[PDB]
Design a protein around this ligand. Structure first.
Ligand SMILES: CC(C)C[C@H](NC(=O)[C@@H]1CC(=O)NCCCCCCOC(=O)N[C@@H](C(C)C)C(=O)N1)[C@@H](O)C[C@@H](C)C(=O)N[C@H](C(=O)NCc1ccccc1)C(C)C
Length: 389
């Protein structure tokens, strides 16, 4: 019904990511672990580093176990190298349990640890399939479901402040909430629609239709799923395949033509500024992603406002304007429904019934004229075709 215990246990923003607190080893070594549903490794910093305020100190853990096996790991933008082992892990603000899970002690890394982010590790919530080195390194959530009773399911509620926050605010703020082994009704409104999980590797879903201000982008759906479509809390923007992305931008551009912006902006690089609280939320279009449903020939949709795709950043010269960056970029690796999009809903990663939940988050940013949404059902056909093989 509601797990008040775990509510608000997240912290951060779509920028650097939303992390949760965990203790590694004996005695407990508190560490803020970045919540990433797009990976499967549990890797914490295990050495001193420019951007780490504290790290994993095996020499001091009485239960640390060496596996004399290393691990290299590349990321769409980054990569770390570490030494595989095991230790006792616990989630302070989570189910009351202690589980032994594989911990990849990051000993060397390039462009991975974000400066200021405030998290020293990453929790790969995905499936073995994508784990490194091989699919035999039992992801953490599995160890958890195997060693305890905790239902095999977790939900996510990421909250974007809607405005830029300073490192002080981040710390003393409620990024979001990750409910371990349950669904807390207080985090969402409306019904909760479900889309099937294609293959249990990444958290893969299938998109069947895409609209901009209601105008069907009208593309062969496969293109939307080109390569694959995933729900990855570790990615910030809404990554879209070139052919699509390009169509999307042509639309978003056209719908906001009353105002023109530099190419830089549309290419997610530079920001756009507006006088304090005068941002034209209304001249920008809403994006509606149609996801496959569980009932044959039936689909539902999620709709986001520009308060989701226009990412808040600090003023060019930290003043009084309100600025953002277009947060939709092309992807050579398919579609990535990242942090932003997620910020618009309460997602139930129900691994058990192999399906992902989507509800309107009780904490998504909006105005009094438009609200995000999860509406359904819709009679569409041959959606299995939208799939990519
Ligand atoms: C802390 C951070 C480094 C975590 C990773 N995030 C990333 O790599 C994200 C992906 C993305 O599209 N974000 C959209 C916002 C763009 C903003 C503009 C700036 O973006 C950037 O240039 N870089 C970063 C930011 C955070 C600094 C970033 O955003 N990269 C994580 O999500 C990793 C995922 C995406 C990943 O790549 N997982 C592996 C994978 O899928 N690998 C496939 C592969 C195999 C062989 C070669 C290449 C890839 C898996 C095995 C663990």
């Amino acid at each position: 019904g509601s797990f008040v215990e775990m509510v608000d246990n997240l912290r951060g923003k779509s920028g650097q990511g939303y992390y949760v607190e965990m203790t590694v080893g004996s005695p407990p070594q508190t560490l803020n672990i970045l919540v990433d549903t797009g990976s499967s490794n549990f890797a914490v910093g295990a050495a001193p580093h420019p951007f780490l305020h504290r790290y994993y100190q095996r020499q001091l853990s009485s239960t640390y176990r060496d596996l004399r096996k290393g691990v290299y790991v590349p990321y769409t933008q980054g990569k770390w190298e570490g030494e595989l082992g095991t230790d006792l892990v616990s989630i302070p603000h989570g189910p009351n349990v202690t589980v032994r899970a594989n911990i990849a002690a990051i000993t060397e890394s390039d462009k991975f640890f974000i400066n200021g982010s405030n998290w020293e590790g990453i929790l790969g919530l995905a499936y073995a399939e994508i784990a490194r080195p091989d699919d035999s390194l039992e992801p953490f959530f599995d160890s958890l479901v195997k060693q305890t009773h905790v239902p095999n399911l977790f939900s996510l509620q990421l909250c974007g402040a809607g405005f830029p926050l300073n490192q002080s605010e981040v710390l003393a703020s409620v990024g979001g909430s990750m409910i371990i082994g349950g669904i807390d009704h207080s985090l969402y409104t409306g019904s909760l629609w479900y889309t099937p999980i294609r293959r249990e590797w990444y958290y893969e879903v299938i998109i069947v239709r895409v609209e901009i201000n209601g105008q069907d982008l009208k593309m062969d759906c496969k293109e939307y799923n080109y390569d694959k479509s995933i729900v990855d809390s570790g990615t910030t923007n809404l990554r879209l395949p070139k052919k699509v992305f390009e169509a999307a931008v042509k639309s978003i551009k056209a719908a906001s033509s009353t105002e023109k912006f530099p190419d830089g902006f549309w290419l997610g690089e530079q920001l756009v500024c507006w006088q304090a609280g005068t941002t034209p939320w209304n001249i920008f279009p809403v994006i509606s992603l149609y996801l496959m449903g569980e009932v044959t020939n039936q689909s539902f949709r999620i709709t986001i406002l520009p308060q989701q795709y226009l990412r808040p950043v600090e003023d060019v010269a930290t003043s009084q304007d309100d600025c953002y960056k277009f947060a939709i970029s092309q992807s050579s690796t398919g579609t990535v429904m990242g942090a932003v999009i997620m910020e618009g809903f309460y997602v139930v990663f129900d691994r058990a019934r192999k399906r992902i939940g989507f509800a309107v988050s009780a904490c998504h940013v909006h105005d009094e004229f438009r609200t995000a949404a999860v509406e359904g059902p819709f009679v569409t056909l041959d959606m299995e075709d939208c799939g990519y093989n």
